[PDB]
Write a protein that binds this DNA or RNA. Sequence first.
RNA 1: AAUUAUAUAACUUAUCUAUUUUAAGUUUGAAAUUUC
RNA 2: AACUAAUCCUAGCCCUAGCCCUACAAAUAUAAUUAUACUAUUAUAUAAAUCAAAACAUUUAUAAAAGUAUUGGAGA
Lengths: 70, 172, 96, 242, 95, 72
Amino acid sequence: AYEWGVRSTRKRVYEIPGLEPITYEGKKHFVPWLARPIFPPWERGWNDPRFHRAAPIHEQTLYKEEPCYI
Amino acid sequence: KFVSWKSRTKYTVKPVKNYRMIDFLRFRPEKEKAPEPFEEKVVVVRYDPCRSADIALVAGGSRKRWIIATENMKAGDTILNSNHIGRMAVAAQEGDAHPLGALPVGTLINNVESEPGRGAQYIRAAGTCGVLLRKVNGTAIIQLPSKRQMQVLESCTATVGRVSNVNHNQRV
Amino acid sequence: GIYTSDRKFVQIKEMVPEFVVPDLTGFKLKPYVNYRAPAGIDTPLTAKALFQETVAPAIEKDFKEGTFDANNLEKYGFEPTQEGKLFQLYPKNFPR
Amino acid sequence: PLHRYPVHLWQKLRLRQGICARLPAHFLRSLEEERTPTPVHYKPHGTKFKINPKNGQRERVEDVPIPVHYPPESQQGLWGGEGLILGYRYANNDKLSKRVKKVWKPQLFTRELYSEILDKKFTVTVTMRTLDLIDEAYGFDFYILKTPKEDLGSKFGMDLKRGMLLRLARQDPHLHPENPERRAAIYDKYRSFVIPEAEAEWVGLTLEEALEKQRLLEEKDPVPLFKVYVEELVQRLQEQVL
Amino acid sequence: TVIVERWWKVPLAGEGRKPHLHRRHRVYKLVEDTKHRPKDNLELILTQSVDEIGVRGDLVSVKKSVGRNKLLSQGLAVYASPENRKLFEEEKSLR
Amino acid sequence: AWRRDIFGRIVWHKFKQWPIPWYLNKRYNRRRFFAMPYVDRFIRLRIEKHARIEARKRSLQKKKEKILHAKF
RNA sequence: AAUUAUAUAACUUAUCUAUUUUAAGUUUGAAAUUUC
RNA sequence: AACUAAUCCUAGCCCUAGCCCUACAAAUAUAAUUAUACUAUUAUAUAAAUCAAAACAUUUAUAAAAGUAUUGGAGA
């Protein structure tokens, strides 16, 4: 079958024990010469509809195993 | 400024700005079906701007999908797609998708795949037909339009009949 | 205000500045001052002067009485955080 | 005008002033000290004097090290002093022949070695010479710790050395978890390399990492002047009471 | 391992100077390269059985990569360090 | 805080208010606070330019001194 | 054209890989030199 | 004694010496200088050639011993 989509567009210090590698988190901006930090979850403190994502259907209380055809 | 135009997420039969998404893996189990033989109806024989041969719309169940048209494919014809390897000769209607094991030696085929699951990549041009030179157990010999004879597993899907425009290869 | 989707303006009351105008009735200060009034030598206020004027007297009284401890720095006026105040010294959260 | 100190002395002046001076002495010594790598592709002269055959006179001798290129990939593996020798070759080893640009590649491999100190098996790029050195060093962990940085010739090896030194220095219980008795044996086996925790932290650190670490060490949040004056007032009042 | 030597004699720099290399001094002679040679012999202990090179437990001398690429890569052979060598003989003595 | 620009100079960077953290703000990360390698040539020019500036002012002062000698 | 043509590329042998009982040859030519 | 013109002395520089250096607000790398989310974020292989060899080909610098021993189409 012909493949559609040009191929062009198709897709140490840390291991050391007892110490934590230095990262540019303090710098607050990326620099190639410092290690990439691992960031904990961020808390906005309020709900932004523009960035909010709907909860999955199965988690809804009204979810029913039987299929209702509308 | 170059962005690939082949980025349509959903397969559709409507022309796409037009391009019609062709399906070269003939036996793809459609919605609400098990991986067992299923049948489809040739709704219309349309013209494909991007291919020399004419594409015939084949629809079955709840799925409609464009496919290449064989020599005798016409509107309203019925096309069968079977995965089962027939113990005896299987009834052959031109345009039907059957394993090479099902078909008997000498039957003209097209839209063959070199490897099982690869999908149709050869005999997709107008007037191209593959001849089943030999058949033994799970292996068959299919003559491709380049005249190169290749041996493939019987699991590979072969569509009976020649491609439309039977005299395309005879063009002067 | 904020420009939401669909190119629609939606004014936000909180972001709209409100001019707090003081009452000038009973206020004795005017734009100009007498030439008869002698000018005062400039003495810019500093943290040392502010601490001495306000915080020093309390500690001096407490130190003599002995009722002083490190835990009660907030008692003498230290603010652990600027949160909760409408006007935060740092980061500044109010306009001029 | 002209610079009173040459450009090469600019680095020395920078090291002698600012945060560089404040850097730990142990780390500063490690950076300052330079040790010649063990010869591999060239043989140093055994004697310092030889008799020139033509004149029959004793003359002092000098050593010319062969140029060797060590790619950064060696810094991610454990090479036993082997390196890429880049240069020109004469075909058939006769000067009368044509000159061809040649890159001589020692045969490189990726292999797994077990570290007792870290109790983990590491897959590393290694050469046959390194394996012999590891056996001569009486263990992979011993080889990393015993071998100096220049002879080791690997940033990854240096990172292992810092971890091993830090692990050994701290008596960290992380070594061989749930096996306290086994943990002590490893520490005793490699006890020779036990050093102060401060020194082990800075082993193998890059210059950019070292400067940031020292900057973080000396960074201090601004002191609220309220607290400073409170202590000063109390000190003055306490002094007056005396 | 590759060993090279400069073709052109470089003028001596004396007691405490460094000679200045030139274009003709940049050309080198290859005295010995392991690449052109067949693999040199390497000493290894077979930890498994390989066809027609002996049996597990023996010490065999085989060409470095030939032994390494086949025996060690599959795991058939292992390196004999001084520490494990004394352990193996002690283990063999108890065997 | 004090930050290094792409020109190699050290300048005080005033922080800005954002609703998201820096790491979740790609545009802020897009802003460059690092100096390119080619700035090394510029750094030498700055030192030379500073030395040149001292020479030029001394030459300027000398011309002014001519006025003092000429007038008196 | 004559003369060579260890750029490369191939094959043979090494090489490197599997198993298991680039170098040296040669060939093409990236080219080189001389003449026309 | 005529119109066009002309007259002036410092504006400043140059070479050495000396000397390393460590000299408002607001907005900004997004489209720089756009007060808040988009889109992740990144330079550089021998320097060569020209040139000299009157062309061109290996080649062609960049305290005394001494321009000696040596090297070189033994030639610049």
